[PDB]
Structure formats: structure tokens, C-alpha cells
């Protein structure tokens, strides 16, 4: 066996939600996979520094939120913050 993970299937699902009849070449999918990973790393590293500067040993949704605000440009930040807060509020309402 040989297994390597990627966000490809999740990227594909989201593509179908915004453009039901549009496909994506493997190369473009590879670029989308690199993009998602790049975003993950930037936010995580920023959250990491954030926790370190404040002598906190735990990275919570609050550090992720501040990191998003430092990383994204005006409008994207606002919408990212909403989607983020929304997913956490809902995640917390269950179980």
C-alpha cells in the first residue's frame, strides 16, 4: 500500500457547491491543495506565536481568530471570522 492524504475530495465538494457544472484539471486541483495547506500553515504558525507571546500553552479558537485577523485583508477577514465563529457556535451546540 501507498497512501498520501490531500484536501482534493473536500475541494471538489466545495467546487460543486459554487459551480455545479464546472470541473477541475488535476494540475489546478494540485494548486488548490497547495493553497489550502499554505493557509493552514500560515494561520497555525501565527496562532503558535500568538500563544507563545502570551505565555499560553493552548491554541484555541480565539488564537485562530486573532491569527485570521492578522493574516487576511479587510473583507476576507470579516467573512472568515463569521464562518469561523459560526462553525464553532454550531459545533458547541451539539453533543
Amino acid at each position: 500500500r501507498k497512501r498520501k492524504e490531500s484536501y482534493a475530495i473536500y475541494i471538489y465538494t466545495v467546487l460543486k457547491q459554487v459551480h455545479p457544472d464546472t470541473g477541475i484539471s488535476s494540475k489546478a486541483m494540485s494548486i488548490m491543495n497547495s493553497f489550502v495547506n499554505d493557509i493552514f500553515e500560515r494561520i497555525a504558525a501565527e496562532a503558535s506565536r500568538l500563544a507563545h507571546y502570551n505565555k499560553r500553552s493552548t491554541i484555541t479558537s480565539r488564537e485562530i481568530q486573532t491569527a485570521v485577523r492578522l493574516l487576511l485583508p479587510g473583507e476576507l477577514a470579516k467573512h472568515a471570522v463569521s464562518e469561523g465563529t459560526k462553525a464553532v457556535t454550531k459545533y458547541t451546540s451539539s453533543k
Binding site: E46, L50, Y53, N54, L70
Partner: protein, 81 residues
């Protein structure tokens, strides 16, 4: 009476240019410079304040500024860190 950005006077701007090796300055430079300085400060201060709020403080520390400058790629030595 006055406006804050206008507090950065023509002579102060001239002095900066001088340290920058500039010999002749056109009149339109002063307003262009103020706008550039305003953008520089907005960007760094926005980040500095964001670190402040995250730490639940009401006081902007030198470190908040140092961290903001570092992530803007303007590392500053001499004020901590």
C-alpha cells in the same frame, strides 16, 4: 487651527529626506510623504492593537509594536524581543 498628520511638518520631512541623501525636493512631496507615512502607521498600528486586544489589555506595549513590525517584515532591534 490644525490637523494631526499636518503635525509632520515640511521641515521634519525635509530632514528625513536629507538623511536619505536627497538634495532637491518638489513641493508636492510633502503631501505625498504624509500619505505614505499614514499608510505605514495604519498597517503597523492595526497589527499592534490586534496583539493588544488579544492579550486583553488597554495599553499598547513596545512588544506589541515589535511583534507587529516583525510580521510586517520590518524587524526592529532595541525594544525587547
Amino acid at each position: 487651527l490644525r490637523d494631526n498628520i499636518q503635525g509632520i511638518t515640511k521641515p521634519a520631512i525635509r530632514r528625513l529626506a536629507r538623511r536619505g541623501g536627497v538634495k532637491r525636493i518638489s513641493g508636492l512631496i510633502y503631501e505625498e510623504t504624509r500619505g505614505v507615512l499614514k499608510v505605514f502607521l495604519e498597517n503597523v498600528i492595526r497589527d499592534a492593537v490586534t496583539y493588544t486586544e488579544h492579550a486583553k489589555r488597554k495599553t499598547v506595549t513596545a512588544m506589541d509594536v515589535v511583534y507587529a513590525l516583525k510580521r510586517q517584515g520590518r524587524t526592529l532591534y532595541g525594544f525587547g524581543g
